[PDB]
Amino acid sequence: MLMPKEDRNKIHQYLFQEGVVVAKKDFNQAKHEEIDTKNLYVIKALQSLTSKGYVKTQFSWQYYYYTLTEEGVEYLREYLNLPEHIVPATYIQERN
């Protein structure tokens, strides 16, 4: 799709920081809860990011549920430059 690198990074960042993403199937939502960009930006960014492996997509009652893979983790590892043993939400919180 056609989108500024700003809005690009914000997603990709968010995906690494979280590992998981959700987004109702609506386009023209201007900005969606959490990630500060166009809703349409989220979905077609992920969807791209998916069809190259990297992330699992799921649908159900109008909402898109995104799972990052492992090979994707390595890819976000690149696009953000960050070193191995970085993050993802693959930690077990405090003692939670």
Binding site: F16, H85, I86, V87, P88, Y91
Partner: protein
């Protein structure tokens, strides 16, 4: 499937349930990476990371 082979269904179908009690009886005993991301954008938050000067006329 034709009824000309239906004996060999029930048999092969039985053994399927045989192995499905094997797997479920064998399942009646059977047999770090730190840093984070909001803590590394605040860790590598020390400067030397930009530049700013302009505006004239």
């Amino acid at each position: 499937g034709d009824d000309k082979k239906e004996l060999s269904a029930e048999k092969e179908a039985q053994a399927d349930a045989a192995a499905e009690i094997a797997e479920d009886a064998a399942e009646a005993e059977d047999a770090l990476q730190d840093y984070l991301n909001q803590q590394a954008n605040n860790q590598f938050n020390k400067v030397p990371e930009a530049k700013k000067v302009e505006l004239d006329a």
